[PDB]
Ligand binder design. Structure first.
Ligand SMILES: Cc1cc2nc3c(=O)[nH]c(=O)nc-3n(C[C@H](O)[C@H](O)[C@H](O)COP(=O)(O)O)c2cc1C
Ligand SMILES: Cc1cc2nc3c(=O)[nH]c(=O)nc-3n(C[C@H](O)[C@H](O)[C@H](O)COP(=O)(O)O)c2cc1C
Lengths: 108, 105
């Protein structure tokens, strides 16, 4: 099952909702992530160029897909097939961002 | 500001998240709507053909926009400029639906 993250549109995109699969994939409970920017999923082996592409796309409210190395709450790495899109009203205003996370690590 | 509703993909698309503007527009608190299908916003003068187009779009996970008559908690009618889209993973599985509601009364 794929995770879903919903964030606020503005001011560093704090998480406002995660689905159950997000907790299965990442090991974080909703309590532990609400109000935070999702960058806490990254760590030392995360590719900086990938993070830069995400940062520029989100600032521009442009959809983006990347494979990015992320980390579970207890530090276990996983590859995240990540897709982020703005949610817009019909006037084009960004209401939120939605991200889908698929664990594409062969853990076992 | 526009409302946002997030639902599960299956089992009659129960609401799992609403933003602040949803409550400003509709007069419902989150605890009054979570776990329910959004159709409770409809009422006596809602256009049945519009509802049927939404039903078919959600069944097929097709993006759709409609101007639909809805009702606030206090029973006052309002025009909802509603846009719904599926949220998909890379393999095309539907993870959720997202709806944006603009009060265009
Ligand atoms: C809706 C949404 C979901 C996100 N999900 C993830 C994720 O699962 N993993 C991740 O590494 N970054 C994720 N991000 C990206 C980070 O929040 C952040 O935008 C990125 O690290 C680039 O900005 P920075 O260089 O300021 O950290 C997400 C962002 C948004 C808006
Ligand atoms: C994410 C989402 C948001 C929705 N928001 C609204 C809404 O604001 N107003 C409304 O009348 N129907 C809304 N609906 C539509 C109803 O939930 C339902 O799909 C529609 O009435 C057609 O199905 P039915 O014939 O089974 O009721 C929404 C549906 C989804 C999936």
């Amino acid at each position: 099952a794929s995770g879903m993250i919903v964030t606020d549109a503005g001011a560093d995109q704090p998480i406002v909702f995660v689905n159950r699969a997000f907790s299965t994939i990442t090991g974080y409970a909703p309590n532990e992530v609400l109000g935070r920017n999702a960058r806490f999923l990254q760590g030392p082996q995360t590719d900086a160029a990938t993070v830069a592409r995400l940062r520029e796309a989100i600032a521009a409210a442009r959809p983006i897909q990347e494979r990015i190395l992320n980390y579970r709450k207890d530090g276990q790495p996983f590859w995240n097939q990540l897709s982020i899109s703005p949610v817009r009203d019909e006037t084009g205003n960004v209401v939120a961002f939605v991200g889908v996370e698929t664990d594409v690590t062969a853990h076992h």
